[PDB]
Amino acid sequence: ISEFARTQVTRAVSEVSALKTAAESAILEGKEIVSSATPKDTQYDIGFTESTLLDGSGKSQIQVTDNKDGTVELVATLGKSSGSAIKGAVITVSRKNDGVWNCKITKTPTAWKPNYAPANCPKS
């Protein structure tokens, strides 16, 4: 892979962020949000495919926290084809109960550089 590290981080943020639509649909339907190949009963799977930039396999690349209170976290870790200077960093795309979302990056590796974070998902 020849993409820039910052392009990889941004793509990953976009891949997680693309799932907000589905999370909003689950919330309107009164269903628990999941990312699973085996959603149980009333659970609503958010339709994620797979990324070349995230650790884990398929739907398990996105870790969902659904507190059932209008807040949501969609969490992924940079891995696989990601450059060594970003691997292990965690993207968290979070919803407040007013329906406003935000993004942050945490747990970055030593070799992280400021310019790798996009303006829409700052390092915390």
Residue numbers in the entry: 25 to 148
Paper text:
The type IV pilus is a diverse molecular machine capable of conferring a variety of functions and is produced by a wide range of bacterial species. The T4P is a filamentous polymer made of type IV pilins, the individual protein monomer (PilA), that is polymerized by several chaperones and minor pilins to form fibers that can extend micrometres in length with an outer diameter of ∼5–8 nm. The general architecture of the type IV pilin protein is an extended N-terminal α-helix connected by an α–β loop to a four- to seven-stranded β-sheet, termed the head domain, which packs onto one half of the α-helix. The C-terminal globular head domain faces the exterior of the assembled pilus, and in P. aeruginosa pilin proteins it features a conserved disulfide-bonded loop region that is responsible for cellular and surface adhesion termed the D-region.
